[PDB]
């Protein structure tokens, strides 16, 4: 089997991407944030505290003929941005892009933090990191990908995120029309439960490539590119008037600037992030200070290849017995 679903930016900045997901019978379609940095599929629901719901579409298990309470199971998750959610668990039929899993754990939120409530466009998350990170207790649950894997034509999914445009998540196949040149594969460590890999270095603009190992994660659920302070300082030093602002919470730059590209290494291959991808616009409405898309990972404890980096590539998440990542230009 295969599945193919379009993923759409939630706003004009590509802050996140939403993908429609069918849950239950008859189908209830929710728009979920596919997150390769977490392992819970959780939804706004008929159980969510009413004051914490503001415009989201909810899953109502009582209206699904295939929903069953997973008795005694609870979940609670905290993300890198400080957001959180928790609740109880149902099993139900879940379909993505025509690919169906029966018996998927659908984590029903009873509580969500303010950042979720305030984002009316995101009806929940679909985690695509390794199932070792799933938070359901006392019986850990599998991701949608892990439950689909054995049925797929190939044990893979691909992320093809757009810049200010829709893109695609495919399950079970490589679309050889979706990228240019060849795919370069690189080793993955699953020790922390993430798609963790080592970049071979970077370049700023037209500068020379610096060969240096940068361990990080491929995380579709993180907006920005978070790299070591040395690398980030080297990038922003090429932008006149850029500075790190403790008041704003990272590097800002004059909105009048033209940003340089950023290149990262994948083995001997190179992925180029255009300068435009690194502009996250005014820090507040009407400001002439703009927020940077490359930020320091110091204090986060891991480097994160978030959407800024991933949307410059066609990315293969290879869930074979030995997992690997692949990157191609596009
Ligand atoms: Na922000």
From Swiss-Prot:
One of its GO terms (molecular function) is aspartic-type endopeptidase activity. The active site is at residues 35, 199. Disulfide bonds join 255-290. Keywords: Aspartyl protease, Disulfide bond, Hydrolase, Protease, Signal, Zymogen. It catalyses: Hydrolysis of proteins with specificity similar to that of pepsin A, prefers hydrophobic residues at P1 and P1', but does not cleave 14-Ala-|-Leu-15 in the B chain of insulin or Z-Glu-Tyr. Clots milk. Its EC number is 3.4.23.22. One of its GO terms (biological process) is proteolysis. Residues 17-328 form the Peptidase A1 domain. Belongs to the peptidase A1 family. This is Endothiapepsin.
